[PDB]
Amino acid sequence: NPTYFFTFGDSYSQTGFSASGTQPSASNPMGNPDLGIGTTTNGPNWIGYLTTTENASLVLSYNLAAGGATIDNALVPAYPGDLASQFRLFEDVYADKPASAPWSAEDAVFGVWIGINDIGNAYYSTDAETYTPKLISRLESLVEEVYKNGGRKFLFLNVPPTSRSPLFLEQGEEVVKQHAEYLSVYNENLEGMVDDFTKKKGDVTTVLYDSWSFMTKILDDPTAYGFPDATCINDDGTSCIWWDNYHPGMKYHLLQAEDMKPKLRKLGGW
Template sequence: MSPSLSLFILGLGLISVVRAQSPVWGQCGGNGWTGSTACASGFVTSMRYSQCVPSSSAPSSTGSAPPASTPSSSVKANYWFSFGDSYTATAFSPDSTPPQPSNPMGNPSFPGGTATGGPNWIDYDTVTFNNSLVLTWNYAYGGATIDANLAPPYTPTVLSLTDQVNEFLNGAAKKPASAPWTGENSLFSVWIGINDLSWSWWQTGDRLAYSDTLLDAEFALIQKLYNVGARNFLFLNVPPFQRSPYSLEGSNTTAPILQGVIEDFNTKLVQRVQDLKANNTGVTTFLWDSYEDFNKILDNPTQYGFRDATAFGSGDDLFWG
């Protein structure tokens, strides 16, 4: 939702007093929303996500991070624990301000530090395209690989998926007051593998067998999450970055080889997700096929508002940053 549309919905909430009103924490706008855009007396529409929040919890107009607070027992929050690389990262620090109703991304202030310079997919899903209060702990780190011992990141300071999961296990996994999550009201998502395959596809040895090595490490971490109570898992596969300008600048064989490695990894990921559910009780899994959806856009870029499939830089009409 654009800022102007958010302002418009806020205005409707102020003037349409005769309409049915949404209760505190109730939805009052968003993609496809056809219900009330007015909030009950004493509450205001949040500017960051279309939901009615108490006046005292409304986000600051300055955009600065609010002080830490704990969701009250009456707030039916859902908790999202996210892991990944720069496609997901928002520069969140688990040692700083935790997610809370007035800033569901926690820190930094929405949308955080992203590779796009603006909201990324997890920002939008937490703040805009949601039907309930979602508090997101986003451990994703730019440049991350699954394990630095298997695929070294571009700099040793990068937190791998292994590091990110350990951060969670040493913090929010213990269910502090700011994150009283349960297996039923929490989601654990992982979007990883892009940097691993970018580093490994051209190495010597059996590249397809290496996909198994990477996935062994990833799902050993997923098992640790399950062991502390995680039950709902969202996985995102590797997008077709063989079609990126960077990959296309290589030799004529670069893109086809890279494509084969990515597709092999994604096929094996599907099986690992199925095995996770089959071998553990009470597990619900979701898999978003970013590979297919990216290809749909790249095959018809102008249909989706992009200039073409290969231009890159800064601009709303460029697919590649």
């Protein structure tokens, strides 16, 4: 009795899963590539840990996240594999519940982690108060496509403090602040959307995971989590928070997955 975990997002979530590669099964829950390959962490990422370490029952991961993704290239553009394109890949391959992924409302969980690159690319050129509702509305319309397919269980991760990644720290404190203030508005509007969606539909189970506060706790007291400081980079993924100047390592992702597990119990796989 598996949970079908369809995930959408950017390089904080990518694993290199191909829809034409080996598909998920009980003996191989990630499908492809091997667990711990294809990420920006030097090992598993939060999806790999949720699927194979923190899972309370069988979880099958169909991870459509793509590096660099923004929500929709008609809004903030970046790479072809935007969130809209990931939803289209889902609609093309899995939405009709094929034999390879015969999901139902009771056992499918749709996880979305998006907005890092929308904010990263547009925080200085757009007005957060009037522009982020457009991004959030487009996210909502994509979510509605899955809802129309029969999806009813949703996991949304808000945007973490990438304002304090080394990449942004080196641009100066006022840039950190400009980025952080924009991001806060985005996350407030994300929360309002998820709340409104949940109430309006009445038949969905939703989790809004506050990755922002969790990462911030670690950045504010890194040694409490076994990290020497909040700024060092190490591509072993465990010695520092940061695997490179813009992505956290596998140790951070494991800590986040462990923090998420109790919050995901209501979604059925945890």
